[PDB]
Design a protein around this ligand. Structure first.
Ligand code: ANP
Ligand code: ANP
Ligand code: MG
Ligand code: MG
Lengths: 352, 357
């Protein structure tokens, strides 16, 4: 049987399918090491909200991120939104094997989960015997619609990839966030930290106390508001405008007429997100603010946010202590670091 | 399977590192938070004599209780553990098999055809394998790495763990565990473990093991019936002490003055002579003509200023193994006792380090 470990000699790809891009990350373990990484832009309306709509379009883009990454791995960990997952702890009969529970859960899930039985993808974990009654066990349940799973399974299939693990995004963030312990000066158990993930069309506040998420809020603020003022003012395309953010080269009036106002729009948004959280719970302050997402790469945006809020702020970098494959561009990776938090957390799932 | 789902927050649970040897049983529990490790629990429970002869468990009930007793001394709630068999118990061989066969299909055939590729009889073999890839000689066949041992070596350790309420999730090999713990010595060695070529000398009670480690991998292994019991036996005889008495005075001291010149010094030289021959055996065997470092392991490596002697007499930089140098410690863990037992826990640590690789 599989008690044997006579041979010392598995890693999975971290694939984050977003609305504007597909991100791939490969990790190894000894100390961690980045074997490969790539980001491939998506066609518009290919992924609306957190749902894949144009099936074949995502597949092609998924196929293109593989060649750009240039890897031989073919299994991957993908993530669904936490909004699609229902988590609850129920009581079931004791003395049942995991196979028996799984079967009964295929039969009787509709009673515990709001989704219609046909459409339920359920996951469970026996916590242990109920303290009250030795006849019953406490069973943790996490379920989502099979639609969320199958569409990602099919989308990965178009690139010859297989979904080894269907993870949840909030959990993957926690895993990669734990790698930030070095940069904060204490292990994350000590701290309550507000992670601000500033994407292209969405900004997310995630408060993590001792490593576990207590708060999540989302707003329609993002980096696309920055691009579209670049497109508009300078007559550049979506592709051209995006590079000008990284590469620069925009005329002198860029800072004062476009970038500085957007920074203020970021600061005001981060400020508003934090105020929503304070008035919604027991917490009166946060220890740190961690900027994540592509828009977090804006020069000295961390310093400005630190000023206007008064809370310690840093740009997320899960690859700070990691080693790098020679074929991985160290400069490119550093600039895309705060956008790879989710992709990093999915890749960290491989070692469990 | 149908569960391709990772919707529930995995525990990512660790395992106990249990090193069952001929004279003692050692336990170690590890965790990690940042880049720094932490010793959650550890205890050592001595074994009855003739309970484990050579690398074989002989008294099943006797081993289990000492195993069960260590748990309590360590005071841990973990019930799953990693145990290790000796590399001398493992046959390693690379064979060619039909291509296009699944992992499941190959294992089924390997259970029947085990006898053909392995020295052991069909009924008494525990076989492990890994597909490497297409064979170079013939692209129609695949290379499969085999590692196998006698089923008895595994089963008695599983049953012995069961009697203490423990489960052997992983049956490891002692040499691999040594490699994992040896990596932690990067700080003390003044160089990365990936670069250096190091001869690790594990001086036990009844067994001495030489392991040459180049870039992290084992290339050489030689064993001798030389050990620290030779020192303990001389203490028993000359001063009328018991095995327990002799062992305690070995560490704590307080014996009469003639002990150094007539007992301790001759044994020290006997240690140096032993290490000398092993390295000479190794240089006159393989391609290597010299090594960068010598790492002393086993409780006998705790002998005061023994490290300098071996270092001076051989002419190679030498260090006493301590895998808990950079590690953090649980409050319930004796920081002083661990230090004195540090070099003896190389194998037990590597068994616990199995979870973090
Ligand atoms: N160096 C940079 N400076 C400023 N902005 C950048 C930089 N690099 C990337 N961006 C912006 O970062 C955004 C992409 O962030 P990313 O986190 O990948 O979004 P997303 O989470 O994939 N999409 P969504 O969450 O659906 O809105 C793009 O709009 C870019 O404009
Ligand atoms: N302070 C000390 N100084 C010198 N020797 C010591 C000291 N403390 C313990 N020892 C001895 O170091 C020896 C090493 O023990 P250890 O290597 O754990 O035994 P073992 O390897 O389990 N048995 P074997 O399989 O025969 O090697 C023990 O026999 C102790 O007698
Ligand atoms: Mg995002
Ligand atoms: Mg030993």
């Amino acid at each position: 049987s599989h008690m044997l470990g006579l041979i010392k000699k598995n890693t999975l790809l971290g694939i984050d399918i977003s609305s504007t891009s597909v991100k791939l990350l490969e990790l190894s373990r000894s100390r961690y090491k980045v074997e490969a990484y790539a980001v491939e832009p998506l066609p518009p309306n290919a992924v609306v909200e957190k749902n894949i709509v144009e099936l074949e379009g995502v597949g092609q883009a998924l196929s293109r991120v593989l060649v750009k990454a240039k890897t031989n791995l073919k299994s991957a960990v993908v993530a669904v939104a936490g909004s699609a997952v229902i988590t609850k702890t129920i009581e079931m009969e004791a003395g049942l094997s995991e196979d028996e529970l799984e079967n009964q859960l295929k039969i009787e899930a509709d009673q515990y989960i709001p989704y219609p039985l046909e459409e339920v993808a359920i996951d469970f974990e026996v916590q242990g015997l109920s303290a009250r009654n030795p006849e019953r066990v406490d069973v943790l349940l996490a379920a989502c619609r099979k639609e969320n799973v199958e569409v990602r399974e099919a989308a990965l299939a178009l690139a010859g990839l297989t979904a080894k693990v269907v993870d949840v995004e909030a959990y993957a963030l926690e895993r990669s966030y734990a790698l930030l312990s070095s940069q904060l000066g204490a292990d994350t158990d000590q701290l309550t930290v507000a992670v601000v993930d500033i994407g292209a069309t969405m900004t997310t506040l995630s408060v993590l106390h001792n490593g576990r998420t207590i708060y999540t809020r989302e707003q329609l603020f993002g980096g696309r508001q920055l691009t579209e003022e670049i497109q508009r003012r300078y007559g550049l395309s979506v592709e051209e405008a995006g590079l000008a953010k990284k590469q620069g080269g925009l005329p002198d009036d860029y800072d004062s007429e476009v970038l500085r106002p957007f920074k203020d729009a970021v600061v005001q948004q981060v400020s508003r997100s934090l105020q929503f959280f304070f008035a919604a719970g027991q917490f009166n302050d946060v220890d740190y603010i961690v900027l994540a997402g592509g828009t977090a790469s804006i020069q000295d945006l961390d310093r400005l946010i630190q000023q206007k809020i008064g809370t310690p702020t840093l740009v997320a970098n899960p690859f700070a202590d990691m080693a790098l494959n020679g074929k991985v561009n160290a400069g490119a990776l550093a600039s895309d670091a705060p956008a790879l938090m989710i992709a990093c957390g999915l890749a960290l799932r491989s070692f469990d």
